[PDB]
Structures are given as C-alpha cells and as structure tokens.
Amino acid sequence: PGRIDRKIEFPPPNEEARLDILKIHSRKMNLTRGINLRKIAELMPGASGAEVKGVCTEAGMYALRERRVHVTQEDFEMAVAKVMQKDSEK
C-alpha cells in the first residue's frame, strides 16, 4: 500500500460519453446539415473510446465509395452495423 500513490480506473464510456467522442472526432469530417448524432451513439452499446474513431473514419469510406463530398447521416448507421459485427466476431 505504500508503493503506488493513486490508482485510477477507466470505465468504458456511457451514452453521454460516447456522444462527445463522436463530437470531437467529427470536427475534421465534411458533414451534411441535420444528422442527430445522439441516435448514432445509442446504437453502440458501449464498445470503447477506440471504436468511435473506428466508425467515424470508416464513415468517410461509404461517402467516398459512392463518390460523394459530404458525409450523410445514413453512412454512420451503415458504419455501426459493420464495426459492431466484428464485435460479434470472436
């Protein structure tokens, strides 16, 4: 007990904390007006703070594979169903 001065637990993020990680990461994407990110963060039942960038970077690929220049709100819900599929893989 004298060795380590303070131990800090990191929980997986909840619904309020999955939202703002999406908010900070979506700063550098080209967005379309009217998205409702709150619906997107509720689709992920607490994976971690690392799949959030796993989704938001991959959501650009859907808009690029159909040759768009703005990321739409149906690209994210298309992206959640692929990243959480590997959650269901092993």
Partner: protein, 279 residues
C-alpha cells in the same frame, strides 16, 4: 574581362569526378556533404550551382582531391531500376484471383484509389494511408495480388527484394535504402513493394557482432525516410511478410503503417470459387 573568368572556373569539373551526398549548409556558399567513401566532409561550393536545386537528399559531385561541391546530378539507383514495363509485368489479371472479394476491394482503397482520385481524400479529409502491411499463412496470394496490382496500374512500380539491403561493404545498405525513395520521389506518383521484411525488421538485436549493427542501421533509414513525407507525394509502400510475430512495433506506428490486411485461409465459400477459376 569578367566573362573570361566566368567560364574559366569550370575547369575543375573535368572528368575524374566522385559522388557524395548533400546533408546541410552552414551558411551561404559553404556546406557539408557525405562521400560514398563513407566519411563526411566540410566542403566548399561552386558558385554557378543554383542552390534551390538542392536537398531532398541530393546526390552531388565532388572533386577527387580537393573534395568540394562541383555539380548536382540527376538521381540514380542500381537496385532496382524502374520495372522496365515491356517484359516485366507478370501478366496476372484480377480475374485469375478467385474468391478474394474483401481483399481485392480493400487493397484498392489504399493503394491506387488514393493514387488517382486524390482530391476526394483531400476534400473529405480522411487522411489517406501511408503504407500497408499484408500478411498471413504462406500460400494465400500475397505475392500474387501484388502481381495483379502491378499489371493493371498506371503508376510507376518499384519492386525490391528485402534481403538485398545487407550488402557486404559498410554503408552500402543505407545508401541503398535512401535512393529507393529518392527514385520514388523524382520519378512519379510511384508504388514501393518490399517483400520478406523479416529479413530486415526483426525484434532482437545485438550490438557486438557487426552483422547485426549493420541491420540496425538499415531499419533506421526506412523508419526515418517514411517520416520524410508531407501527404503531398503519392508514394505508397506495400509490404508483405509471412510471420507478423517477428516484427518491431516501432515499424507499425501510425504515420508509418496504419493498414493491416490478413489473408486468412479459405474454408468453403471462398474455396469453391478457386476451383472455378483454376479448372
């Protein structure tokens, strides 16, 4: 009378000329080069050289005795040259690779789709990947898929075997690294392919043998030279191995290798597609 001496100074450039490499400059009209005899020097210039033709890592010319800057050169490498494009493509089409729906699609998104449609990656801003690492069990089309990319490409393709950087003489290897990427710089929006990186990028080292001190200097060049990119050049590095265990995670940091492709072994669904193509 000044125009008489203006041409008279170039007697120094005559024939018997040796080759160094530019490193930096102290000031106006005086610089530091490193010879291909291995030793570095503090040298003088010749005034007719446009200074703004210098330093990516510029191959220069040096006087064989007095050893100062003489002339700047077009780039050069011996290994390999540029994939001579007439009788060099290994003529495998995409259709010969059966049952690789994910990976043929996904190596397209990281190698040649950011090669041509570059501005969409710029306009959406999704940070196109610098290099790619492909791996898996032996006999899953690692070398085969690289053949098909190098057949349907429009960009320059540079193809090296990654066990040739260990030359006998000292310093040959780090020179052999830095002129590959210089040749991928000057030529084109090119593509680098390096195979069997296990011959270079291992985990354990030993600074007492000399055969292992050289390999330590091999890796620190390409780890340096992959940091000398500025998102503007379209130089993509494809790298393929057999054992992903025996690799340093210093090589797999973001900024150097961000995309990892496994080639798993096919089971039934991709298995019957292979029988269609071969038979």
């Amino acid at each position: 009378e000044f125009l008489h001496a203006q041409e008279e100074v170039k007697r120094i450039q005559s024939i018997p000329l040796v080759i160094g490499q530019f490193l930096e400059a102290v000031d106006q009209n005086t610089a530091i080069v490193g010879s291909t005899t291995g030793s570095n020097y503090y040298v003088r210039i010749l005034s007719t050289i446009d200074r703004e033709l210098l330093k990516p890592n510029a191959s220069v010319a040096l006087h064989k005795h007095s050893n100062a800057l003489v002339d700047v050169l077009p780039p050069e490498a011996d290994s390999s040259i540029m994939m001579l494009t007439s009788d060099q493509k290994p003529d495998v089409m995409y259709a010969d690779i059966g049952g690789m729906d994910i990976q043929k699609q996904e190596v397209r998104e990281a190698v040649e789709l950011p090669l041509t449609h570059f501005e969409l990656y710029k306009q959406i801003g999704i940070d196109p990947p610098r290099g790619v690492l492909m791996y898996g069990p032996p006999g899953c089309g690692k070398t085969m898929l690289a053949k098909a990319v190098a057949h349907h490409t429009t960009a320059a393709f540079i193809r090296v075997v990654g066990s040739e950087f260990v030359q006998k003489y000292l310093g040959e290897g780090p020179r052999m690294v830095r002129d590959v990427f210089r040749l991928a710089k000057e030529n084109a929006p090119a593509i680098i392919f390096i195979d069997e990186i296990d011959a270079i990028a291992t985990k354990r080292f030993d600074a007492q043998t000399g055969a292992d001190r050289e390999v330590q200097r091999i890796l620190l060049e390409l780890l340096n030279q992959m940091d000398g990119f500025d998102q503007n050049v379209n130089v993509k590095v494809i790298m393929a191995t057999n054992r992903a265990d025996t690799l340093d995670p210093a090589l797999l940091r973001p900024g150097r290798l961000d995309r990892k492709i496994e080639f798993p072994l096919p089971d039934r669904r991709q298995k019957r597609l292979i029988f269609s193509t071969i038979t």
